[PDB]
Amino acid sequence: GETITLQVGQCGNQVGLQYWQQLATEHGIQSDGSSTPRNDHPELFFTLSDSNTYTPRSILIDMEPSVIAKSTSALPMFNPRNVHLWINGYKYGTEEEETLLNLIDREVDKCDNLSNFQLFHSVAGGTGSGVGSKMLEVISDRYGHKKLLNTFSIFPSVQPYNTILTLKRLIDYSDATFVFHNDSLNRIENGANKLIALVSASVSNPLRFPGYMYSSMESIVSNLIPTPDLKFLTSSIAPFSTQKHNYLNEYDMLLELSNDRYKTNRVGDTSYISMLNYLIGDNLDQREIRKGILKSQQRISFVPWVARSVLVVHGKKSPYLKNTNLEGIQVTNNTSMIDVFTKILKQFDLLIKRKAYLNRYYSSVEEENEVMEMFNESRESVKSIIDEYKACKEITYLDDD
Amino acid sequence: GETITLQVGQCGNQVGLQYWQQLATEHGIQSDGSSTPYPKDINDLQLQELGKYRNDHPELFFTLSDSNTYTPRSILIDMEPSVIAKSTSALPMFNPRNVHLSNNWINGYKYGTEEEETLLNLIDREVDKCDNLSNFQLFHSVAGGTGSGVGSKMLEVISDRYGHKKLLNTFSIFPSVVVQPYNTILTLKRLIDYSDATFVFHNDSLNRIENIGANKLIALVSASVSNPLRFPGYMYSSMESIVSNLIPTPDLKFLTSSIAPFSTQKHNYLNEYDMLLELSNDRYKTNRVSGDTSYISMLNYLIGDNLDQREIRKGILKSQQRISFVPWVARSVLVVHGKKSPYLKNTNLEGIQVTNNTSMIDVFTKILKQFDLLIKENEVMEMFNESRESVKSIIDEYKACKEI
Amino acid sequence: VNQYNVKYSAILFNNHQGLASMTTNEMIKLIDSQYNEILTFLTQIIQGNNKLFTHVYNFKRFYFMETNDFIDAIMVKGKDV
């Protein structure tokens, strides 16, 4: 089925520009939307006119026109009709609810069979994070739960308040949320949006370049989310490619994809809940992959109550990329989320006991009570998810004792 | 049949000039009246190695002279000569004989009454050139001065001089000053009494569409309504047949039109299926319509070469469920497969939707409220009372339309 | 037809001595050439000078009611006859 991309905020718009440039390069679509000389299926991400032009399905949302202007000028094939221009931002989103609801309904009507909503946004984006938090609520309300949502939220490197307020709605409404940290991205680079764009583009490779299996997003996601509570994913990318000293075999890709240094978020000891590895090359040797799967299963520490299966998808490289060597992406579901969530909660508590900057949000007695109850609910939800991820680790998870 | 166009008032003349230039462009008739040779048909395939003949009906509007020169069937009525001078200069094809030259509605109405014989002679002269006349088209503004009074008097004169044996449309433009509400109600009284089908255009909603001039949109809608007549197809091809499909009773005669704006921007509609869904949007209707509206009749125009039947069928099926039909009217959506003029180079589709919904309750309510506020020889006050009662006579009727 | 008759008589009776004095391969080739030429000319007449497609289109235009204006004119004019 078709997918709709939502871009919110300055960071979201920049990441989306890199993402769409990568996708258009992979499908050979020119900057003006004209084709270049089919077995691939860009229709899932591009709308095809009866004049042979490809335009992205994405929707651009931002508080200021400079970022949107740069993005549109860089890629002229964006449709201008889809362009629209913390608590203050969220209340502003309430005012524009009708316009945005109709704007999204236009894209849904334009496609034939909708599958999922992609969202590119930054949790630490301030006002834009507020408008994206409202976007999740309105979409989930109007379209129910038949269509799932995927959020490629960028985590932060007064900010604690914003991170908690955005994470409350991220937990409530998102169906499968990727976690990216600028710290680990710049550590890997030792710009940064080119890693996120690459990971997001590769995550959907089996859909755009069909093969024997994994033809739908339901199959890709369902392998990684045993419970709707544990919805945060850790993504790992192998950087050593296109150099002379590349990984010599896909088997070494499978073994060295699990290194903790390549993960896109700060990690000690972790337990894996689910696994799925992407291998993308013109030709793939099966016996190497079998040996690598066996070693990966014998090496990785799974939680007791999970089936303990490692899945390797055999992605196909784009014809428009000339004979490049193998590359691969790893997406995992770990219990390492407790560390980052604990860090966020510690910062939030430290800055909530001290009334440092709450004057910018508490306007009156009723506003004080409103913000206090909202903050308490967000804190309780985050603690609930931490406790759930902690109870997953132990062996008595399925016991009623 | 034949159609006679009458333009009254400055706004009416401004709209009519572009309406006639649009028609002349579609039919390949130059501004001097000279005709252009007809290009070969596109779907009339022919074997291949590897002048007066036509298949349209332009003469339904233009009088074809013995010297192969076309001339519109238009009559221009107003008092200020500047607009008429501009219109004639832009289009020399207009017949000078057809031009007639001379704020309070009463003054204009009395002027029309005193000089009714000359205008009537002009109408009869235009009719005498027509064999098997079909209908009259009126372009006038409900409020604005000359247009209101003169158009109302011409409405009455034409209605009673021919025994109402031919239907009479009305492309009225509603206003977006102390005298304006009086003029609006006074003209709407005669619109109720005499007009057979009224196309309500609201200037504020036209400005809302534009910012995404205002007369160009009116000209486009008016010149696209009659597309089946000028390019005959399987269905309709008669002005009475199109109107009769949207007017269930004489009272529910007020129609409103929706326009798809993006006929030229390179991000135009992908296909017919997309445009069928986009036409129902309330942001491009020419009359402000709320969410409590209900539709009495549906009619969609499609203008393009070799439209895909699968897309149209699927679009009709999807759009039928979305539309909220009045309980006592069967769910029916009709699509007109118009033919694009071969003279036009643009290959993009255009589509105009004409609807008969119940949103008129709010519009006439606003007009009535403004009139009531402003009210707070004696003959004129009796006419005001009569107009108030006549307007209420269809206010309550459109309200009752909701009920089985 | 006369031009064709001369052209292919110059092959059957001048190049060769009749159908009997022709090996099966050459006889089949000759018949194939005649078939292609004949159907080429039949197309060039029927869909050429006759304009078969145009007249089929006109059949559909008039019999299948397409030009509704003409029929409306007939019915309004003959409403008494």
Side-chain angles (χ1 to χ4, degrees), chain A residues 1-358 364-401, chain B residues 1-289 291-404, chain C:
Chain A
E2 299 85 66
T3 82
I4 292 170
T5 295
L6 277 91
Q7 314 189 29
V8 181
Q10 180 283 127
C11 329
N13 279 277
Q14 281 274 33
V15 165
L17 171 60
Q18 302 299 325
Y19 170 47
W20 283 112
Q21 278 197 353
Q22 175 59 26
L23 214 72
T25 302
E26 289 185 28
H27 291 295
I29 292 164
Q30 305 191 3
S31 310
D32 69 354
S34 65
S35 313
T36 306
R38 63 189 293 166
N39 268 265
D40 45 27
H41 287 78
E43 72 196 65
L44 309 177
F45 292 86
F46 294 97
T47 37
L48 175 57
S49 65
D50 292 346
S51 66
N52 187 49
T53 66
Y54 288 110
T55 84
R57 305 234 201 209
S58 97
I59 299 162
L60 303 181
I61 295 164
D62 185 24
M63 204 267 268
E64 302 191 10
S66 58
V67 191
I68 302 302
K70 175 172 289 296
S71 182
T72 307
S73 179
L75 206 61
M77 81 205 178
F78 267 83
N79 183 352
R81 295 185 66 203
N82 285 332
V83 163
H84 182 242
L85 300 180
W86 182 92
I87 181 159
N88 263 7
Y90 169 82
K91 275 185 167 69
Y92 150 78
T94 299
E95 302 299 324
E96 310 299 329
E97 174 170 306
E98 52 275 60
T99 304
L100 301 172
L101 197 63
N102 158 67
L103 186 63
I104 295 159
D105 289 345
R106 186 187 297 154
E107 290 295 332
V108 166
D109 296 342
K110 202 172 296 288
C111 82
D112 169 45
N113 183 32
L114 188 65
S115 181
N116 80 316
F117 288 85
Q118 290 191 332
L119 174 65
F120 288 88
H121 82 281
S122 170
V123 166
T127 56
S129 73
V131 66
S133 72
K134 185 64 175 180
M135 281 295 78
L136 295 150
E137 192 255 350
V138 288
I139 289 170
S140 209
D141 188 17
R142 148 171 297 278
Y143 278 84
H145 303 51
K146 261 143 211 170
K147 314 322 211 203
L148 84 162
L149 291 87
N150 300 69
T151 67
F152 304 108
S153 61
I154 279 83
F155 262 50
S157 168
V158 74
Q159 251 299 313
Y161 314 120
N162 299 303
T163 309
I164 272 296
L165 301 203
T166 278
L167 197 60
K168 165 64 159 57
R169 324 281 190 291
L170 217 76
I171 283 167
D172 291 337
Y173 301 144
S174 178
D175 312 74
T177 287
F178 285 69
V179 169
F180 294 104
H181 274 232
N182 295 289
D183 292 310
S184 301
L185 289 170
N186 62 62
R187 187 190 72 186
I188 284 168
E189 188 57 40
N190 280 359
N193 298 332
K194 293 179 179 179
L195 279 309
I196 313 185
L198 190 136
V199 169
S200 295
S202 305
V203 157
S204 58
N205 196 86
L207 313 183
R208 303 190 318 281
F209 290 103
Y212 289 96
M213 191 168 172
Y214 288 102
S215 195
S216 181
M217 201 75 168
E218 311 145 288
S219 309
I220 294 177
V221 179
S222 59
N223 289 337
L224 318 173
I225 315 293
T227 314
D229 305 84
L230 304 94
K231 80 180 60 52
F232 296 90
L233 290 79
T234 284
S235 75
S236 172
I237 164 169
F240 288 121
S241 66
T242 78
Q243 306 101 356
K244 224 78 192 85
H245 298 86
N246 61 273
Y247 300 103
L248 66 148
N249 294 317
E250 41 275 40
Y251 161 58
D252 319 303
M253 216 149 258
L254 291 161
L255 292 195
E256 271 85 340
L257 261 170
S258 304
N259 291 357
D260 304 338
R261 62 160 58 183
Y262 302 144
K263 289 187 192 306
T264 51
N265 43 297
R266 290 184 179 276
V267 178
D269 192 16
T270 58
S271 302
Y272 289 76
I273 281 143
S274 272
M275 281 285 268
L276 185 146
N277 306 348
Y278 294 90
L279 294 175
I280 305 175
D282 331 276
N283 293 293
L284 283 171
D285 219 6
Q286 180 65 23
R287 74 192 41 261
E288 301 325 290
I289 297 171
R290 287 201 297 257
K291 180 148 47 78
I293 285 165
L294 191 87
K295 300 295 184 180
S296 302
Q297 285 197 334
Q298 293 174 344
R299 271 178 87 153
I300 286 196
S301 306
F302 287 76
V303 285
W305 54 268
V306 161
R308 205 163 285 99
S309 64
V310 169
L311 295 156
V312 185
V313 312
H314 300 76
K316 286 160 56 177
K317 182 156 283 288
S318 171
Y320 297 100
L321 298 180
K322 293 179 179 179
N323 197 31
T324 316
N325 41 84
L326 175 65
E327 81 206 340
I329 288 304
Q330 167 149 321
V331 178
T332 88
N333 199 346
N334 317 336
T335 66
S336 68
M337 296 297 103
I338 67 181
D339 292 342
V340 290
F341 281 169
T342 41
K343 282 291 300 302
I344 284 154
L345 272 192
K346 290 313 184 64
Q347 295 273 21
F348 178 73
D349 277 332
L350 168 64
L351 209 73
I352 201 45
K353 304 302 320 313
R354 287 178 48 232
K355 213 195 78 178
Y357 320 111
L358 295 194
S364 177
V365 173
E366 80 280 351
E367 211 87 349
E368 277 172 38
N369 188 271
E370 172 164 299
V371 300
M372 269 327 100
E373 61 77 13
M374 171 46 58
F375 275 44
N376 280 346
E377 292 306 340
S378 305
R379 181 153 94 78
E380 288 299 325
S381 295
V382 175
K383 294 199 288 274
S384 179
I385 211 53
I386 273 174
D387 289 345
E388 168 66 85
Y389 261 105
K390 283 157 56 55
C392 183
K393 195 166 56 64
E394 55 160 55
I395 201 163
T396 82
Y397 188 49
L398 302 185
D399 300 331
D400 202 25
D401 305 336
Chain B
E2 267 83 354
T3 299
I4 289 167
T5 302
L6 319 166
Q7 308 134 324
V8 202
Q10 153 174 279
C11 294
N13 290 313
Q14 284 174 20
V15 171
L17 168 62
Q18 294 161 11
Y19 170 85
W20 282 116
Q21 275 188 327
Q22 169 81 30
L23 286 181
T25 307
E26 320 205 330
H27 291 300
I29 307 169
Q30 308 185 26
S31 69
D32 63 337
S34 186
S35 73
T36 307
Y38 203 75
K40 81 186 180 214
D41 289 345
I42 188 154
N43 66 352
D44 184 48
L45 309 180
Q46 298 194 1
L47 188 76
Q48 296 180 0
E49 300 170 47
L50 62 80
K52 295 187 190 293
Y53 294 158
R54 285 170 161 261
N55 62 355
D56 63 342
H57 205 196
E59 302 133 89
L60 195 135
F61 286 104
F62 308 90
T63 58
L64 175 53
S65 70
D66 50 3
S67 303
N68 196 16
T69 76
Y70 289 92
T71 289
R73 278 181 178 83
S74 59
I75 296 179
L76 299 135
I77 321 176
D78 63 335
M79 317 163 182
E80 251 285 302
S82 303
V83 307
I84 296 314
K86 287 189 292 185
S87 179
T88 304
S89 77
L91 273 183
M93 76 167 24
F94 278 130
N95 200 327
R97 278 125 50 152
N98 286 28
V99 170
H100 183 277
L101 294 178
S102 186
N103 44 47
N104 259 266
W105 182 90
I106 295 289
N107 292 67
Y109 188 84
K110 284 288 188 281
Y111 166 53
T113 300
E114 182 82 356
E115 237 179 52
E116 72 185 290
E117 67 93 45
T118 299
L119 269 309
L120 185 49
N121 175 279
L122 190 44
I123 308 304
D124 298 328
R125 180 221 201 78
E126 284 314 310
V127 168
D128 285 350
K129 299 179 173 299
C130 279
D131 42 330
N132 194 239
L133 200 75
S134 165
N135 75 311
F136 295 82
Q137 282 186 326
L138 185 74
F139 286 94
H140 79 319
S141 182
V142 193
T146 89
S148 316
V150 183
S152 183
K153 187 54 179 174
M154 281 295 78
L155 221 43
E156 182 253 1
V157 162
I158 294 169
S159 160
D160 309 86
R161 251 297 318 265
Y162 294 170
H164 218 99
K165 303 298 180 248
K166 306 128 185 164
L167 75 93
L168 166 49
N169 307 101
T170 295
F171 285 77
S172 53
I173 294 169
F174 276 66
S176 45
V177 182
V178 294
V179 81
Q180 292 207 11
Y182 297 144
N183 295 12
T184 304
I185 212 77
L186 278 206
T187 304
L188 198 90
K189 191 283 185 193
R190 282 80 186 173
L191 287 193
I192 299 276
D193 275 298
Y194 307 135
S195 161
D196 220 333
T198 305
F199 288 81
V200 173
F201 296 98
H202 202 305
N203 260 1
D204 281 324
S205 198
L206 260 287
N207 290 330
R208 183 71 65 162
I209 304 171
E210 170 56 36
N211 77 267
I212 310 173
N215 298 325
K216 283 281 191 74
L217 277 76
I218 312 294
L220 261 53
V221 173
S222 311
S224 296
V225 161
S226 64
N227 185 281
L229 320 181
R230 311 189 317 279
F231 299 102
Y234 288 81
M235 299 170 312
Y236 311 127
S237 62
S238 196
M239 180 51 87
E240 47 219 42
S241 76
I242 295 166
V243 162
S244 166
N245 200 88
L246 313 180
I247 301 194
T249 75
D251 285 73
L252 289 107
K253 90 182 84 185
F254 283 70
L255 313 181
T256 196
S257 50
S258 168
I259 170 158
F262 293 117
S263 62
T264 185
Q265 184 182 110
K266 64 179 180 180
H267 306 279
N268 58 311
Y269 314 120
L270 321 183
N271 52 46
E272 304 89 337
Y273 166 86
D274 154 41
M275 171 145 48
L276 255 287
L277 303 183
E278 210 206 57
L279 277 168
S280 76
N281 200 317
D282 315 344
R283 276 283 317 259
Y284 311 122
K285 302 226 165 65
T286 58
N287 163 335
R288 166 62 43 112
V289 53
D292 197 23
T293 191
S294 47
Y295 292 81
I296 307 143
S297 280
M298 211 43 193
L299 192 69
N300 295 305
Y301 288 80
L302 294 186
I303 311 180
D305 277 15
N306 52 261
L307 307 179
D308 294 326
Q309 188 56 217
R310 286 161 321 279
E311 308 278 281
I312 281 140
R313 194 61 31 181
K314 198 167 67 169
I316 290 172
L317 264 287
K318 279 203 182 185
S319 198
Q320 178 187 0
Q321 308 165 46
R322 206 179 316 287
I323 278 195
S324 50
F325 276 99
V326 168
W328 59 265
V329 152
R331 292 218 156 182
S332 86
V333 175
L334 279 147
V335 159
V336 175
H337 298 63
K339 305 182 194 300
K340 186 143 214 207
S341 171
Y343 281 114
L344 297 174
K345 294 320 182 293
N346 158 5
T347 59
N348 190 23
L349 297 91
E350 301 102 38
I352 299 331
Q353 166 190 299
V354 179
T355 43
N356 192 356
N357 52 58
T358 58
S359 67
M360 319 304 168
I361 299 168
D362 307 301
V363 178
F364 291 138
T365 299
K366 266 183 142 283
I367 288 304
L368 198 77
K369 275 171 47 59
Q370 284 168 342
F371 170 70
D372 283 345
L373 260 54
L374 261 284
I375 277 274
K376 304 323 155 296
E377 296 196 320
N378 187 53
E379 61 156 320
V380 310
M381 189 151 63
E382 182 169 320
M383 249 165 195
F384 279 124
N385 184 31
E386 287 289 355
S387 297
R388 174 91 170 61
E389 292 163 295
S390 184
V391 170
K392 199 65 157 66
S393 202
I394 63 138
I395 289 284
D396 43 18
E397 195 298 354
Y398 265 103
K399 286 180 176 188
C401 183
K402 300 294 301 194
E403 305 190 332
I404 64 170
Chain C
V1 169
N2 174 64
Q3 187 184 351
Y4 172 94
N5 183 12
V6 165
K7 172 192 171 183
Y8 274 117
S9 285
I11 300 170
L12 278 170
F13 288 46
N14 206 326
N15 189 28
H16 286 79
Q17 335 287 314
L19 258 204
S21 294
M22 271 205 168
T23 172
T24 310
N25 200 50
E26 161 66 340
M27 176 178 73
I28 293 160
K29 175 57 55 203
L30 168 72
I31 280 174
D32 271 343
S33 181
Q34 284 194 52
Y35 189 71
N36 281 275
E37 178 161 8
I38 283 287
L39 292 192
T40 298
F41 190 64
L42 179 69
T43 300
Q44 199 265 301
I45 278 184
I46 298 284
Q47 290 158 15
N49 296 359
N50 296 132
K51 313 202 280 313
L52 188 147
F53 185 70
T54 301
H55 295 301
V56 169
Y57 189 9
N58 296 338
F59 272 147
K60 148 174 170 278
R61 192 120 67 82
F62 289 110
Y63 279 117
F64 296 151
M65 293 314 326
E66 175 165 315
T67 36
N68 194 78
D69 66 338
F70 178 40
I71 311 299
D72 213 318
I74 275 179
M75 283 180 336
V76 69
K77 282 295 187 184
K79 72 192 188 80
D80 46 359
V81 173

